[PDB]
Design a binder for these strands. Structure first.
Length: 50
RNA sequence: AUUUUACCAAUUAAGAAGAAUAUUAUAAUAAUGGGUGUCUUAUAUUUUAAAUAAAUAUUUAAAUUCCGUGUAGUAAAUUUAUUAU
């Protein structure tokens, strides 16, 4: 398995890509990782001020 | 009458489009694989899968550990955005 072997298969690097990944990723791993922008740590959640 | 010894020296101003829709970086608005001298026929032209990836991250702490390979929303669609004869 390429991921197990730690093979750097990237389209801009060698023109290859692993077949077990998803073609479209809505938000990258960094976007998923950043939790302060996802949870209610300090950010306000309802911008409407009635 | 006859006849001028042997050897030794040096590179510089360039005659005429015989040099530009040029070379490199730079545009954050396009994009189904560009192919001209091409020019029916689609049983014969199908590439999809939750993972670090043509998507790429503002600090020195603590901390697992026999050389600590290491830092968080900054604004919630907010303007750092892969641009372009």
């Amino acid at each position: 398995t390429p991921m197990m072997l730690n093979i750097q298969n990237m389209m801009w690097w060698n023109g290859k890509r692993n077949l077990y990944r998803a073609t479209y990723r809505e938000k990258t791993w960094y976007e998923i990782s950043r939790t302060g922008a996802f949870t209610k740590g300090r950010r306000p959640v309802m911008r409407q001020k009635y």
